[PDB]
Design a protein around this ligand. Structure first.
Ligand SMILES: CC(=O)N[C@H]1[C@H]([C@H](O)[C@H](O)CO)OC(C(=O)O)=C[C@@H]1O
Length: 472
């Protein structure tokens, strides 16, 4: 009655600290998406040198047209070239990290949203002081460029031409429309046809220009079921406020609202930090959305904005409360229009926020569910129906550490509350960061990180199971 398949390594990592046959050491941060054509897209972070949250990392995906039985070749969405002059090769490359997948059910366009950092240690190597990244000139927005020795703000305008702080064009230009595989030529700084450097390089630079050391949010899309992908789109300035230090997505799979006055809206989990307590107490979860099928993006209010904690109000931009944080999350919409946000936190159990206006604002009280343990690791949840009954599946590590992956089943009551029914294990051993997707015909897929036999950091594996496996 109940069946669960053996694990299928989609992105097989190296061993005992060595690279695999392809020269890749580690894989991390999975994302699973079932497309309109029934295809399964497995995304991940290709860490070519080590497992840490920085370095030469590429955004790759694999496709399956047989519900996960077989998988095609690796398809790279983005892979910025590393700095050939960096002193420490482990931290001498622009970074891309933490992918989120989602498809618009009207246009059939598939989106991929991920973080982007210039050369350095990613989120752990952020310049303490702020550097304005964009400038608004007569309506249009341009990315700022800083010149060595100078204080003014150059800008990247039409055709990638660099403009002086006084608004006059220069002989320098940026590669704004890359053409190389994986778009590895993005940010290349030219002076005519002579390549000088890259605006994303921060050390031992060969060119005089660079962008701000900040957190950026990029987006690539595919109009052919994930076969080919667009060049990266910089959506940072559409959603990132000036007070935000870090702005990154909660890895996994987004959703499209299927009912209510905001049907068609796309939701992408993200979380931020302020300049008050950076990652010590400002980690706040929020959501961005697009009401025009991915053309423009907008930022909702954070769950922590105007939240009452221990008799005091707080805001994501000013808080310094370790335990009140909420990071990487996963979003789900109920049949009653409400939106639930399952957030990674530090309370030891599951925290859930609710929204009645499409994820823009959140309710007063954050619900906690001790039945589901949260060991402070990523999680993914999806909505599913069965014989006219509303359910929600959520998966995450069961404990004691990032171990023993679990699959929790909950009933969506008429009032909007959740009743947790069963908790079945899906993988013994190491288990961190997973992504759920419904496959149809009562079948469900899951992509998750796991190691065994001395495998490096995480190998991402895939499994299927049915409703009978879910109901104890
Ligand atoms: C952008 C980034 O670095 N994301 C990382 C995330 C982050 O460090 C933490 O959420 C800070 O709060 O956590 C971890 C982790 O293994 O726990 C992995 C992610 O790759």
């Amino acid at each position: 009655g109940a069946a669960l398949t053996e694990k299928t390594d989609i992105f097989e990592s190296g061993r005992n600290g060595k690279p695999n046959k392809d020269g890749i050491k580690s894989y991390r941060i999975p994302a699973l998406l079932k497309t309109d054509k029934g295809t399964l897209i497995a995304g991940a972070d290709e860490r070519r040198l080590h497992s840490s949250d920085w370095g030469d990392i590429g955004m790759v995906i694999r496709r399956s047209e047989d519900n996960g039985k077989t998988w095609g070749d690796r398809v790279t969405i983005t892979n910025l070239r590393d700095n050939p002059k960096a002193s420490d090769p482990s931290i001498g490359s622009p970074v891309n990290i933490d992918m989120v997948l989602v498809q618009d059910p009207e246009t059939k366009r598939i989106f991929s949203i991920y973080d982007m950092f210039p050369e350095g240690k990613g989120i752990f190597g952020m310049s303490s002081q702020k550097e304005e990244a964009y400038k608004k000139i007569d309506g249009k927005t341009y990315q700022i460029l800083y010149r060595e020795g100078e204080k003014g703000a150059y800008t990247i305008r039409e055709n990638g031409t660099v403009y002086t702080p006084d608004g006059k064009a220069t002989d320098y230009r940026v590669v704004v429309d890359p053409v190389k595989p994986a778009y590895s030529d993005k940010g290349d700084l030219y002076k005519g046809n002579q390549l000088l450097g890259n605006i994303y390089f921060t050390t031992n630079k060969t060119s005089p220009f660079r962008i701000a050391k900040d957190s950026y949010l990029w987006m690539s899309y595919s109009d052919d079921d994930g076969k080919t992908w667009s060049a990266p789109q910089d959506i940072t300035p559409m959603v990132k406020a000036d007070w935000m230090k870090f702005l990154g997505v909660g890895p996994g799979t987004g959703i499209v609202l299927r009912n209510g006055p905001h049907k068609g809206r796309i939701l992408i989990p993200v979380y931020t930090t302020n300049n008050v307590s950076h990652l010590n107490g400002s980690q706040s979860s929020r959501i961005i959305y697009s009401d025009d099928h991915g053309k423009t993006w907008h930022a909702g209010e954070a769950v922590n904005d105007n939240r009452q904690v221990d008799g005091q109000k707080i805001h994501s931009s000013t808080m310094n409360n370790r335990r009140a944080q909420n990071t990487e999350s996963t979003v789900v919409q109920l049949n009653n229009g409400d939106v639930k946000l399952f957030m990674r936190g530090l309370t030891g159990d599951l925290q859930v926020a609710t929204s009645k206006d499409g994820g823009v604002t959140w309710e007063k009280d954050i619900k906690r569910y001790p039945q589901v343990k949260d060991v402070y690791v990523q999680m993914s949840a999806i909505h599913t129906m069965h014989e006219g009954k509303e359910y929600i599946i959520l998966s995450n590590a069961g404990g004691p550490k990032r171990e023993n992956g679990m699959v929790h089943l909950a009933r969506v009551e008429e009032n909007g509350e959740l009743t947790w029914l069963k908790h079945n294990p899906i993988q013994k051993g190491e288990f961190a960061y997973n992504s759920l997707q419904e496959l149809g015909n009562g079948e469900y897929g899951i992509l998750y990180e796991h190691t065994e036999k001395g495998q490096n950091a995480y190998t991402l594996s895939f499994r299927k199971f049915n409703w009978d496996f879910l109901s104890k």
